Amino acid sequence: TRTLWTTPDTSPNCTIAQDKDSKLTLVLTKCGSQILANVSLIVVAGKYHIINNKTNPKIKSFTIKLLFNKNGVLLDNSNLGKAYWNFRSGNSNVSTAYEKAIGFMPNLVAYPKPSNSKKYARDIVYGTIYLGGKPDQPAVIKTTFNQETGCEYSITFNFSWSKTYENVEFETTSFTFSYIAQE
Amino acid sequence: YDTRTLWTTPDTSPNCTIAQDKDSKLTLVLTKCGSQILANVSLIVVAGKYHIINNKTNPKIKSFTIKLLFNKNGVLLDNSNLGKAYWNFRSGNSNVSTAYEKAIGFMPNLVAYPKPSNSKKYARDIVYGTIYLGGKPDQPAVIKTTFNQETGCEYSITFNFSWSKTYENVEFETTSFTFSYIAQE
Amino acid sequence: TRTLWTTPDTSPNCTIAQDKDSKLTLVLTKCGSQILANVSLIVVAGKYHIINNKTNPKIKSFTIKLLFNKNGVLLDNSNLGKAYWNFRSGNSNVSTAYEKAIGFMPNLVAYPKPSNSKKYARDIVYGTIYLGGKPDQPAVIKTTFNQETGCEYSITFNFSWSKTYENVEFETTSFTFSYIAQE
Ligand SMILES: COC(=O)N[C@H]1[C@H]([C@H](O)[C@H](O)CO)O[C@@](O)(C(=O)O)C[C@@H]1O
Ligand SMILES: COC(=O)N[C@H]1[C@H]([C@H](O)[C@H](O)CO)O[C@@](O)(C(=O)O)C[C@@H]1O
Ligand SMILES: COC(=O)N[C@H]1[C@H]([C@H](O)[C@H](O)CO)O[C@@](O)(C(=O)O)C[C@@H]1O
Ligand SMILES: [Zn+2]
Ligand SMILES: [Zn+2]
Ligand SMILES: [Zn+2]
């Protein structure tokens, strides 16, 4: 079982500001010691669905958190819903919730939890995606590994933008990255 | 499919037609890593309209498009910009001795990236990258890759190259870019 | 044998300006005829540790070279130490030094040695990483394949920056790329 994913449909699966306000599409493919990751976001309703920074000058970022336990199982305080995250079966998920996915977790030696030791930047990957596929509508996607509390592992996606957008729907192009696997 | 590589071969022999016949070498390597295809791409334009860019004399020459069209079996169609002759599964630094029949597991996922319809068109079927002409850090061009948006095909991968700098007699040959996409199977 | 790496610890393994002044974290994972590569750099000491271009306007770039022989073994004139460059075992290396790694080497037809033939740019990958994980502290990472001499293969990482940084520590976010393997 080599791919954990959200199913690539458009059905809301994620809660940023209000219940099921978004569809996160995330595909994690195990290539041995690295996980190959592909992500995009469609916000379907609520506060982040249409950005207007004339109306709301300070609405410039938000975060989606995936929190995992010692067995790599998604925790319910995650923004992504548990029902929607599983190993691939065809164009869907297997019908039964998985019990172990440690091989897909971000490596804790590469990406340690917060402590009193010096924090290094290598637990971050920066990328840029484009709202509505327009090259003049960039938004930064910052991905951080294992920096959340209340979990053994975490992947967080912070979305932010510096431009003053006026009535721009928040739905994105796709971005690929990788990270070092725990096992 | 499992873990194979579909590619253009890594030589520099023109295999592609943008403005005139065989004016370019598209180097494209698609490697299957389960439910994702790891893609690596670069371009050398060797002749014709897009070979030497001068936006002082020709300010409107700012973009061009290379289309790969596929049938239900993932076989490349003759009318793509990329020639069929050397697009095949890898064997050594060349290709297998049979033109391939089946590569559906190298195709862009149709649920992820639907064909045009009157349903809402979402941006996730696009990946943006930036490559550099001549390997110079001050000569960016944008490579926009779009999945399954062409007609007359079951699947498609389309590369649009564009630039906003005013280049003066700059040869369009590029650094390499890597992306991935969700596989059909 | 699918992963050649530096280990994910933070122990210095690399000499930029002085002995073991840095940790290059480099993970090469063989996904058939493409190598999936993940890299970051922490500078701990020396000339490139704390960048101050008010004080030292000329300090704008440096290079880290990995040079390989015909069997894909790291030559000791590389900036990276041979001591911990090996195939993966857990969060560590295999017990004995590897003797063949040609399947991890950059392809010589794709990325030829310098010659009289026209030099093409496809043997370069550009990326941007962020010092200290700050989005306003970019530095460019330029990776070049097989352009060094006195070797069968090479991978070189050039780091440079255009901003006038005042007391900014050179430690980076992570970047992923790929390249065509020799076999
Ligand atoms: C890959 O797409 C981009 O790099 N978009 C940048 C964009 C683009 O270069 C320009 O608008 C020409 O169409 O310039 C930008 O300054 C912009 O905001 O438009 C930054 C984008 O990331
Ligand atoms: C990865 O390489 C780049 O980001 N190159 C940018 C380049 C570079 O920072 C500068 O010329 C100093 O060398 O700045 C640019 O504004 C430029 O066109 O020079 C955009 C390039 O994408
Ligand atoms: C992925 O991060 C970036 O694209 N950082 C750019 C950064 C950023 O957009 C801005 O400072 C707001 O955070 O603007 C920059 O002009 C900068 O140097 O700050 C270039 C960075 O590559
Ligand atoms: Zn709406
Ligand atoms: Zn030329
Ligand atoms: Zn330090």
Q: Do C178 and B38 touch (CB under 8 A)?
A: yes
Taking the CA of residue A144 and the nearest CA in chain C, the distance in Å comes to: 10
Residue A47 has, within 13 A of its CA and on its CB side, a CA count of 13
Q: Which atom of ligand 1 is nearest to the CA of A136?
A: 19
The domain in which residue A82 lies consists of 1-183
Residue C76 at interface with chain B, using a CB cutoff of 8 Å: no
CA distance C38 to C44: 20
Buried-exposed string C117-146: b where 16+ CB fall within 10 A, e elsewhere:
eeebbbbbbbbbbbbbbeeebebebbbbbb
Burial class (CB within 10 angstroms; exposed 0-12, middle 13-18, buried 19+) of C100: exposed
Q: Are strands B177-182 and C3-5 parallel, antiparallel or unpaired?
A: unpaired
Contact C159, C29 (CB under 8 A): no
SS3 category, B105: helix
Q: Calculate how far, in angstroms, residue B25's C-alpha sits from the geometric centre of ligand 5.
A: 11
User: Could you give the strand order of the β-sheet that contains B36-45, starting from the edge strand earlier in sequence?
Assistant: B94-95, B88-91, B5-7, B24-33, B36-45, B177-182
What are the chain B neighbours of A40 within 8 Å (beta carbons)? 123-124
DSSP of C102-144: GGGSBPTTTSPPS-SSPP-GGGEEEEEEEBTT-TT-EEEEEEE
Query: Given the structure tokens 């696997």, which residue do they identify?
Result: A181
Element housing C40 (H / E): strand C34-43
Which ligand has the minimum distance to the alpha carbon of residue B130?
Answer: 1
SS3 category, B39: strand
Question: Which residues does residue C130 pair with via DSSP β-bridges, in sequence order?
Answer: C138
Out of B38, B133, B173, the one facing C31 most closely (by C-beta) is: B38
Residue C102 Rama label (left phi>0; alpha psi -120 to 50; beta): alpha
Q: Are strands A175-180 and B140-147 parallel, antiparallel or unpaired?
A: unpaired
Q: What are the CA-CA distances from residue B109 to residues A38, A66, A175, A183, B144 (Å)?
A: 13, 24, 16, 28, 18
CA distance C16 to C19: 8
Residue C60 at interface with chain B, using a CB cutoff of 8 Å: no
Amino acid present at C15: T
Contacts for B45 with CB less than 8 Å, ≥ 6 apart = B18, B23, B24, B51, B171, B172, B173
Q: What are the CA-CA distances from residue C71 to residues B50, B174, C85, C99 (Å)?
A: 40, 29, 14, 7
Contact C180, B8 (CB under 8 A): no
Nearest CA to ligand 2 atom 17: B138
Amino acid present at B51: H
Q: List all chains that touch chain B, counting a touch as 3 or more CB pairs closer than 8 Å.
A: A, C
CA distance A162 to A146: 26
CA distance B102 to B35: 16
Residue A45: Cβ within 10 Å count:
15
DSSP of A43-76: E-SSTTTEEETTT-TT--EEEEEEEE-TT-PBPT
Which ligand has the minimum distance to the alpha carbon of residue C119?
Answer: 5
Out of A110, A122, A178, the one facing C173 most closely (by C-beta) is: A122
Instruction: Give the length of chain A.
Output: 183
Token output for C144: 């070049």
Closest CA to A181 of C88, C42, C103, B182: C88
Question: Which residues does residue C141 pair with via DSSP β-bridges, in sequence order?
Answer: C127, C159
Closest CA to A8 of B116, B77, C146, B114: B114
Q: Do C173 and A125 touch (CB under 8 A)?
A: yes
**A contact residues 151-180, partner B, Cβ 8 Å cutoff:** 171-176
Token output for B151: 């007609």
Interface test with B, best of C178, C179, C183 (most B CBs within 10 A): C178
Domains held by chain B: number: 1
Contact A146, A111 (CB under 8 A): yes
A128 Cβ inside 6 Å of ligand 1: yes
Resolution as reported, in Å: 1.8
Angle CA(B106)–CA(B112)–CA(B116) in degrees, nearest 5?
100
Token output for C91: 């969060």
Element housing C167 (H / E): strand C166-169
SS3 category, B48: coil
Contact A16, A22 (CB under 8 A): yes
Q: What are the CA-CA distances from residue A131 to residues A6, B128, B164, C118 (Å)?
A: 21, 11, 19, 39
Radius of gyration of chain A (CA): 16
Contact A31, A50 (CB under 8 A): no
Out of B10, B131, B133, the one facing C109 most closely (by C-beta) is: B10
Closest CA to B24 of B52, B50, B54: B50
Q: Do B135 and C121 touch (CB under 8 A)?
A: yes
Closest CA to A159 of A30, A12, A25, A59: A59
Contact B5, B27 (CB under 8 A): no
Amino acid present at C58: K
CA distance B185 to B94: 25
CA distance C169 to C175: 18
Amino acid present at C110: A
What are the chain A neighbours of C5 within 8 Å (beta carbons)? 33
Query: Given the structure tokens 């860019």, which residue do they identify?
Result: B53
Closest CA to B36 of C63, A146, C31: C31
**Biggest distance spanned by C-alpha atoms of chain C:** 47
SS3 category, B124: helix
Query: Given the structure tokens 């725990």, which residue do they identify?
Result: A182
Q: Calculate how far, in angstroms, residue B24's C-alpha sits from the geometric centre of ligand 5.
A: 10
Contact B5, B89 (CB under 8 A): yes
Q: Calculate how far, in angstroms, residue B150's C-alpha sits from the geometric centre of ligand 2.
A: 32
DSSP state of C16: S
- Give CA A34 to chain center in angstroms: 17
DSSP state of B3: T
CA distance C158 to C66: 11
CA distance C161 to C166: 12
Q: What are the CA-CA distances from residue C43 to residues A124, C56, C82 (Å)?
A: 17, 17, 18
Residue B55 at interface with chain C, using a CB cutoff of 8 Å: no
Contacts for B4 with CB less than 8 Å, ≥ 6 apart = B31, B32, B89, B90, C32
Out of B112, B128, B162, the one facing A8 most closely (by C-beta) is: B112
Q: What are the CA-CA distances from residue A153 to residues A14, A36, A149 (Å)?
A: 19, 17, 9
Task: Give the domain CATH number at A57.
Answer: 2.60.90.10
Q: Give the torsion sign (CA, A171, A174, A179, B2).
A: positive
A164 Cβ inside 6 Å of ligand 1: no
CA distance C47 to C63: 13
CA distance C105 to C181: 6
Closest CA to A129 of B124, B159, B121: B124
Closest CA to A163 of A22, A89, A59, A33: A59
Q: Are strands A22-31 and A3-5 parallel, antiparallel or unpaired?
A: antiparallel
Residue C93 backbone phi and psi in degrees, to 5: -105, 165
Nearest CA to ligand 1 atom 15: A136
Contact B144, B159 (CB under 8 A): yes
Residue C110 at interface with chain B, using a CB cutoff of 8 Å: yes
